[PDB]
Amino acid sequence: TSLYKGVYELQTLELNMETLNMTMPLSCTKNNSHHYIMVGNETGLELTLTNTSIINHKFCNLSDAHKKNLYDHALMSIISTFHLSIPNFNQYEAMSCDFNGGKISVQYNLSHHCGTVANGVLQTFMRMAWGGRGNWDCIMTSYQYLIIQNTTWEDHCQFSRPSPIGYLGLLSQRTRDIYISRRLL
């Protein structure tokens, strides 16, 4: 097929990353709009770019979630890494959360010229999923909202192979581009 020089051959590898389901979360997507992160073989999360909002309240009850430790620690760490890698995040009105019962729900409002929270939030989306008219490090999408939410595990990511690299890379940049909101911190 692909023979180079006289004997070297372009044999390729397709690493089955499901073998890392027991230690690392894997990212894969279905139709370029439904991205997914699966941790273990029992739980995962939806990442849906859509015009429909499941949440109509501007709250994120994080300290209430930590008070009642009834959630999965892996998922909360995943979303913590996701939220600490958002470049120059400064508008807290956009983010909305739901954690009742241990469910993981996070909605983002991508409403807007550039220098918008939508820019950085899409940036960290493609930092994580690696699946995807904007220029000069500014990206715009017709989708008004994005939803992250808890789900069971299936094989519903035909479009993309599962990979952990998105989360491992996102761990690097957490708290890197954060703004100061208090002097003492």
């Binding site: 692909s2 180079y4 020089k5 004997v7 070297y8 051959e9 372009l10 044999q11 390729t12 590898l13 397709e14 690493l15 089955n16 990353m17 073998t19 890392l20 027991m22 230690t23 690392m24 941790v39 273990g40 029992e42 620690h73 892996a74 760490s77 493609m126 930092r127 690696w130 490090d137 192979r161 990979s163 952990p164 690299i165 491992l168 890379g169 761990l171 690097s172």
Partner: protein, 160 residues
């Protein structure tokens, strides 16, 4: 700092010190064994992606055999060891190449030059993906002959 993890001994008769990938690791390709040279190449290199992946594989294998799965995830180990297993900014370099519009690493397919007669391999490197598709083998043929020349030179130098 840099990575410090070392590859666990692999139960491969042909390759004593080189990480050998089993049937489960490689999709629909049974078992292949790489050798000590290819895996040990990046004990100084910070610009290779596949050997970081096989370090992740070996860390997972150690964590499974020598601890208990318990059916619930322990993200503690991976969050502590991620900087000890893989390079931290190679993913940044590929993200930047992706943003700029040059072909970037997929991190799923890796290509290598299997020496048919002897069975040696170069350390596999990422198959570039661009424009929503894999690059044609013609496009990076030059890189292929680059790696071929590298392999020949390294082998001849080490043998002498």
């Amino acid at each position: 700092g840099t990575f410090t993890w070392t590859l666990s001994d692999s139960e491969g008769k042909d390759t004593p010190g080189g990480y050998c990938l089993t049937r489960w690791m490689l999709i629909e390709a049974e078992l292949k064994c790489f050798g000590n040279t290819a895996v040990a190449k990046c004990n100084e290199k910070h610009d290779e992606e596949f050997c970081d992946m096989l370090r992740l594989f070996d860390f997972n294998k150690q964590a499974i055999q020598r601890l208990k799965a318990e059916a619930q995830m322990s993200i503690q180990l991976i969050n502590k060891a991620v900087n000890a297993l893989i390079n931290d900014q190679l993913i940044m370099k590929n993200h930047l190449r992706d943003i700029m519009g040059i072909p970037y690493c997929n991190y799923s397919k890796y290509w290598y030059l299997n020496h048919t007669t002897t069975g040696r391999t170069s350390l596999p490197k990422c198959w570039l993906v661009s424009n929503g598709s894999y690059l044609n083998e013609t496009h990076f043929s030059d890189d292929i002959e680059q790696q071929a020349d590298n392999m020949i030179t390294e082998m001849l130098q080490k043998e002498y």
